[PDB]
Design a protein around this ligand. Structure first.
Ligand SMILES: C[C@@H](O)[C@@H](C(=O)O)[C@H]1NC(C(=O)O)=C(S[C@@H]2CN[C@H](CNS(N)(=O)=O)C2)[C@@H]1C
Ligand SMILES: [Zn+2]
Ligand SMILES: [Zn+2]
Length: 216
């Protein structure tokens, strides 16, 4: 129902929230980020639709920002739904090589640029992309903002029910959650795809939910 929402978290970090009815999960609430580096804007996940992605880009363009790049945390539509529209506007889209091949295999449009690195800087000292290992999906990534100490966990952070298990790796998820906890204990805020933002303990809650879900 409602249009995409944009909310400031702090200087240069915004949450974008979009809503989509998806067969037999009802209306899904999806959070992404927009990160500002000087007058450049980066989309951390696309909203569900071309429409919401256009509203999001136009909001930052009208406020003087250039959209320099988007990164999709994984291949599902709540992270990649905007890619086709961004490509048509020549806004650089990024995904892991694995994510792009999963999109291809699913008959979806791919990000224009891909990368294979476990840890890499999308923007040096500002936006780090990290693969903790499989969980929600084989390809799931997190995004770390070193200056704000904010972690975007995407659909991997699941403090209250794991959600769509269709493409999940329950065997790996607890191991991947421990790897994430070990790397980003210093997160002062964890933003997830579908849960309220919270403290570093959301990584421990995710570890617990992963184990619980694995134990059938
Ligand atoms: C949307 C689609 O793209 C998929 C995706 O790729 O993520 C599905 N993946 C996940 C997920 O995150 O694991 C979900 S279920 C999500 C987990 N808890 C949320 C409860 N709150 S609410 N008001 O429904 O927002 C709903 C999607 C259906
Ligand atoms: Zn997903
Ligand atoms: Zn999701």
């Amino acid at each position: 129902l409602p249009d995409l929402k944009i909310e400031k978290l702090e200087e240069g970090v915004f949450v974008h929230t979009s809503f989509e009815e998806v067969n037999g999960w009802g209306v899904v609430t999806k959070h992404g980020l927009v990160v500002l580096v000087n007058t450049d804007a980066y989309l951390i996940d696309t909203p569900f639709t071309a429409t919401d992605t256009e509203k999001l880009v136009n909001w930052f363009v009208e406020r003087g920002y250039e959209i320099k790049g988007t990164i999709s945390s994984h291949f599902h539509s709540d992270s990649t739904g905007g890619i086709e529209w961004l490509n048509s506007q020549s806004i650089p889209t990024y995904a892991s090589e694995l994510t792009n091949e999963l999109l291809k295999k699913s008959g979806k449009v791919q990000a224009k640029y891909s990368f294979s690195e476990v840890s890499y800087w999308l923007v040096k000292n500002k936006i780090e992309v990290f693969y903790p290992g499989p969980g929600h999906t084989q390809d799931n990534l997190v995004v770390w903002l070193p200056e704000s100490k904010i972690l975007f966990g995407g659909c991997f952070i699941k403090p209250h029910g794991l959600g769509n298990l269709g493409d999940a790796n329950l065997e790996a998820w607890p191991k991947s959650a421990k790897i994430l906890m070990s790397k980003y204990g210093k997160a002062k805020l964890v933003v997830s795809s579908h849960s309220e933002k919270g403290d570093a303990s959301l990584m421990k809650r995710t570890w617990e939910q992963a184990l619980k879900g694995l134990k059938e």
